Design a protein around this ligand. Structure first.
Ligand SMILES: *[C@@H]1O[C@H](CO)[C@@H](O[C@@H]2O[C@H](CO)[C@@H](O[C@@H]3O[C@H](CO[C@H]4O[C@H](CO[C@H]5O[C@H](CO)[C@@H](O)[C@H](O)[C@@H]5O[C@H]5O[C@H](CO)[C@@H](O)[C@H](O)[C@@H]5O)[C@@H](O)[C@H](O[C@H]5O[C@H](CO)[C@@H](O)[C@H](O)[C@@H]5O[C@H]5O[C@H](CO)[C@@H](O)[C@H](O)[C@@H]5O)[C@@H]4O)[C@@H](O)[C@H](O[C@H]4O[C@H](CO)[C@@H](O)[C@H](O)[C@@H]4O[C@H]4O[C@H](CO)[C@@H](O)[C@H](O)[C@@H]4O)[C@@H]3O)[C@H](O)[C@H]2NC(C)=O)[C@H](O)[C@H]1NC(C)=O
Ligand SMILES: *[C@@H]1O[C@H](CO)[C@@H](O[C@@H]2O[C@H](CO)[C@@H](O)[C@H](O)[C@H]2NC(C)=O)[C@H](O)[C@H]1NC(C)=O
Ligand SMILES: *[C@@H]1O[C@H](CO)[C@@H](O)[C@H](O)[C@H]1NC(C)=O
Ligand SMILES: [Cl-]
Length: 616
C-alpha cells in the first residue's frame, strides 16, 4: 500500500482556529436528591483535578446535570420560602478551584419543591430562584466570570427525565421564560440556550421544536413581549460508532433550523453530547485506550475541516462536547466513556481512591497545543486527496507571536483512526512534508506519540492480570503508560522544511511541535496543591496560567524533606498539570515546588513551596 502523504504549508495561515471542543460533562446517579454526595466526594475532587490539569485550558466547561438538586428549601410557598445554597456553593467552588466553568443546566427541583411548571405560583418562584442563583454567583465570582457560563435548559426535555416534576410542552415553555427572565433580572450580560435534545424529524422531539417556535414567535409568559431570547441552540447527536455520522446528523438539524427559523440564522449551535456511542456506562474495549482518543480527535478534525473551515453552509457551529467526565465502576474501570479510570481500592485502612488518566484525557492535552490559526494541509495516498472523512487525517495550526516570552509555533496533529475499530497488526506509513517555516531563532521540533502498545494504562492493567485492587507498585507500572512517547527537541534542518516518515499504528496520534525560541524563559508555576491519596502517596496539581509559552518539555518537581536540599523527582516527561507522587520509600512529608522546563532547557521560576505533612 502506498504511503499517506501529509503536506502542511506554514506560509498559509488561512483563518482562525477556534478551540470549540473544550467541554466535558456528566450526570450524577440515583437518587438525584443525593447528587451532593457524588459531586462533592473525594472521587469527584480528584476527578475534576484531572479534568482541570489538561494543559493550556484544554478543558474549560463541565456540563453537569441536576445542579438544582444541590439546592434545598426551608418553609413553603405559603409561609415563606428559603433556599439553602451550601452544596451548590461547594460544587461551584470546586470547579472554580480547578479553573473550570459549569455548563449550568437549570435542572432539578430544589429538594422536591418544584412539581409543576403550569402552576403559576411555581413559575414565578422559579424565576426568582434563578435570579437569586445568578446574583449570588455574580457576587461570589464576579460578573465577568459568570457571564462566561453557558446557562442551559433542563437536559433532554423530549426524553422525559423530569423525576417527579410535571413538565408539559406548555410547562417547559413557562419554565424557559422563567429561566430567561430570572437571568435577565440579574444581568442582561448572561447567556442562555437550549433545549439540549435530538431535534428528530417533526412530529418527534416536540418540546425541542416547540422551544424554538416559542422563542422565535411565541409570547413571553412574564412580559407578554413577542419572541424570547435564545442565545444558542444545543442539540445532542451521537454517532452510533460512526465519527462522520455525528457531523451528517448535525448538518441535517442545522439546515432545518436555518430554513424554519430565519431569525436564528446566526444563532450559535452546540452539540453538547457529541459522543461516538450513546450509553456512557456500557463497557466497550475501545473506550479504554487510544482507540477512543484517536476517534475523539478524528471527530474534531472533521468538524474543523468539513464544517467550520469554509463551506456552502458555513453554518454557525460553536461548541462540541464529549460527555465523558463520569466516574467509572467495578468491574469496568477502563472500559466506560470516561476521562479517568477509577479504582476504589478498598483493602487499605482506610479505603482510598486512585484515578488513572486515560488516553482520551491525554489526547485533550494534544489538542490543547493547537494554536489560533489554521494552516493549509492536504492528505493524499496514491495521488488521491483524502478529506478528514478517512482513517488518516490532520489538523495543523500556527501561532502569531506577541511578547519576548513568546515566538512562532506550528502544531501538527495527525490521527490514524478507524473509529471504534482497532487494527493491532496494521502499520500505516506516513510521509509528513512541512514547508514554508518562517525564519526564526533556535527553531526546534518535538514529537509526541500515542498508541495502544506504548501508552495504554488499560493494556498495562491487563498485562498485570487485571488486579481488582492493584498494589502501589502495580499502579506505578500503569501510570508509566499515561504520557505520549516524547522525543527530545531537535534543531530543524537548514532552509525552512521538515520532512518526517513516521510509522503510525491504527489507532495512534502523533503531534509534531515546531517552535522558535522566545527571548525570555517560561513564567512561574502557580497554584500548587498537594492532596492526600493514602499513606505514602499524594497528588500534586498546579496551574500553567502564568507559564506563557506552549513550548514546554516537562515540569520539574522537586521535593525537600527535613528542610534538607530540594531534590528532583525522576519521572517521564509530561506537560499534564498533575502528578501522582508515590515513592517506593513511602516518604512524602516535606515541601514541594514545581517549575516549567522549555525546549531549550531553560527553567521558569519555581512555584511557591508547598508544605505537606502526612496525617499518620
Ligand atoms: C469497593 O467499594 C465500593 C464502594 O465504596 C464498591 O462500589 C460499588 O460497586 C458496585 C459495582 O460492583 C456499584 O454497583 C453498580 O452501580 C451501578 C451504578 O449505580 C447507580 O447508577 C445507576 C444508573 O443510573 C443512571 O440511570 C438512571 C436511569 O436508569 C438515571 O436516573 C441516573 O441519573 C443515571 O443516568 C445516567 O447514566 C445512565 C447510564 O446508566 C445514562 O443512560 C443516563 O443518560 C445518565 O447519564 C442507578 O440505576 C443506580 O440506582 C440504584 O441504586 C441506588 C442507590 O445507590 C438506588 O437508590 C436506586 O433506586 C437504584 O436502586 C436499585 O438498584 C440497585 C442495584 O443497582 C439495588 O441494589 C437497589 O436495591 C435498587 O433495586 C445507582 O444510582 C449500577 O448500574 C450497577 O448495576 C448493574 O449491574 C448490577 C450487577 O452487578 C445489577 O444489579 C444492575 O441491575 C445493573 O445491571 C447491569 O447488568 C444487567 C445484566 O447484567 C443489565 O441490565 C445492564 O447491562 C446493567 O449494566 C451496579 O449496581 C456501586 O455503585 C458502587 N458503589 C459506589 C458508592 O460507587 C466496590 O464494589 C468495592 N469493590 C469491590 C471489588 O468490592
Ligand atoms: C464520508 O464518507 C462516507 C464513506 O464513503 C460517505 O458515505 C457514503 O455517502 C454516499 C453519498 O455520497 C452514499 O451513497 C453511501 O451510502 C455512503 N456510505 C456508505 C453506505 O458506506 C459519506 O457521504 C461521506 N460524508 C461526508 C460528509 O463527506
Ligand atoms: C444548609 O445546609 C447544610 C447542609 O446540610 C447545613 O450544614 C447548613 O447548616 C444549612 N444552612 C441552614 C441555614 O440551615
Ligand atoms: Cl462514546
Amino acid at each position: 500500500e502506498a504511503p499517506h502523504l501529509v503536506h502542511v504549508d506554514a506560509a498559509r495561515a488561512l483563518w482562525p482556529l477556534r478551540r470549540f471542543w473544550r467541554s466535558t460533562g456528566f450526570c450524577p446517579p440515583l437518587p438525584h436528591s443525593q447528587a451532593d454526595q457524588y459531586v462533592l466526594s473525594w472521587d469527584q475532587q480528584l476527578n475534576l483535578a484531572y479534568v482541570g490539569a489538561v494543559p493550556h485550558r484544554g478543558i474549560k466547561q463541565v456540563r453537569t446535570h441536576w445542579l438544582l438538586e444541590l439546592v434545598t428549601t426551608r418553609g413553603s410557598t405559603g409561609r415563606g420560602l428559603s433556599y439553602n445554597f451550601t452544596h451548590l456553593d461547594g460544587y461551584l467552588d470546586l470547579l472554580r478551584e480547578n479553573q473550570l466553568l459549569p455548563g449550568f443546566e437549570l435542572m432539578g427541583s430544589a429538594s422536591g419543591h418544584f412539581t409543576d411548571f403550569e402552576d403559576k405560583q411555581q413559575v414565578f418562584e422559579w424565576k426568582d430562584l434563578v435570579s437569586s442563583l445568578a446574583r449570588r454567583y455574580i457576587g461570589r465570582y464576579g460578573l465577568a466570570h459568570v457571564s462566561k457560563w453557558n446557562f442551559e435548559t433542563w437536559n433532554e426535555p423530549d426524553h422525559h427525565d423530569f423525576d417527579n416534576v410535571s413538565m408539559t410542552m406548555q410547562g417547559f415553555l413557562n419554565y424557559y421564560d422563567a429561566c430567561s427572565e430570572g437571568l435577565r433580572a440579574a444581568s442582561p450580560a448572561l447567556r442562555l440556550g437550549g433545549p439540549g435534545d435530538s431535534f428528530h424529524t417533526p412530529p418527534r422531539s416536540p418540546l425541542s421544536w416547540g422551544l424554538l417556535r416559542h422563542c422565535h414567535d411565541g409570547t413571553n409568559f412574564f412580559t407578554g413581549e413577542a419572541g424570547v431570547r435564545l442565545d444558542y441552540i444545543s442539540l445532542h447527536r451521537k454517532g452510533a460508532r460512526s465519527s462522520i455520522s455525528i457531523l451528517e446528523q448535525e448538518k441535517v438539524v442545522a439546515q432545518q433550523i436555518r430554513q424554519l427559523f430565519p431569525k436564528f440564522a446566526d444563532t450559535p449551535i452546540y452539540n453538547d453530547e457529541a459522543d461516538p456511542l450513546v450509553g456512557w456506562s456500557l463497557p466497550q474495549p475501545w473506550r479504554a485506550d487510544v482507540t477512543y482518543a484517536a476517534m475523539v480527535v478524528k471527530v474534531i478534525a472533521q468538524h474543523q475541516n468539513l464544517l467550520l473551515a469554509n463551506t456552502t453552509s458555513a453554518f454557525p457551529y460553536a461548541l462540541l462536547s464529549n460527555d465523558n467526565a463520569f466516574l467509572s465502576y467495578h468491574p469496568h474501570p477502563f472500559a466506560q466513556r470516561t476521562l479517568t479510570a477509577r479504582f476504589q481500592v478498598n483493602n487499605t485502612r482506610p479505603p482510598h481512591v486512585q484515578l488513572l488518566r486515560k488516553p482520551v484525557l491525554t489526547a485533550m492535552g494534544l489538542l490543547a497545543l493547537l494554536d489560533e490559526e489554521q494552516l493549509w494541509a492536504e492528505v493524499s495516498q496514491a495521488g488521491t486527496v483524502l478529506d478528514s472523512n478517512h482513517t488518516v487525517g490532520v489538523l495543523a495550526s500556527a501561532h502569531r507571536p506577541q511578547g519576548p516570552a513568546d515566538a512562532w509555533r506550528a502544531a501538527v496533529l495527525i490521527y490514524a483512526s478507524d473509529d471504534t475499530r482497532a487494527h493491532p497488526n496494521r502499520s500505516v506509513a506516513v510521509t509528513l512534508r512541512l514547508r514554508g517555516v518562517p525564519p526564526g531563532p533556535g527553531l526546534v521540533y518535538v514529537t509526541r506519540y500515542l498508541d495502544n502498545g506504548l501508552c495504554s494504562p488499560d493494556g498495562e492493567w491487563r498485562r498485570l492480570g487485571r488486579p481488582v485492587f492493584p498494589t502501589a507498585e502495580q499502579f506505578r507500572r500503569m501510570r508509566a503508560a499515561e504520557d505520549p512517547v516524547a522525543a527530545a527537541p531537535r534543531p530543524l534542518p537548514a532552509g525552512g522544511r521538515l520532512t518526517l516518515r513516521p510509522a503510525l499504528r491504527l489507532p495512534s496520534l502523533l503531534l509534531v511541535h515546531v517552535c522558535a525560541r522566545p527571548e525570555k524563559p517560561p513564567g512561574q508555576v502557580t497554584r500548587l496543591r498537594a492532596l492526600p491519596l493514602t499513606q505514602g502517596q499524594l497528588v500534586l496539581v498546579w496551574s500553567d496560567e502564568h507559564v506563557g509559552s506552549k513550548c514546554l518539555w516537562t515540569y520539574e518537581i522537586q521535593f525537600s524533606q527535613d528542610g534538607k536540599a530540594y531534590t528532583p523527582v525522576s519521572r517521564k516527561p509530561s506537560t499534564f498539570n498533575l502528578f501522582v507522587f508515590s515513592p517506593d520509600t513511602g516518604a512524602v512529608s516535606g515541601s514541594y515546588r514545581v517549575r516549567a522546563l522549555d525546549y531549550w532547557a531553560r527553567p521558569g521560576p519555581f512555584s511557591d513551596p508547598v508544605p505537606y505533612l502526612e496525617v499518620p
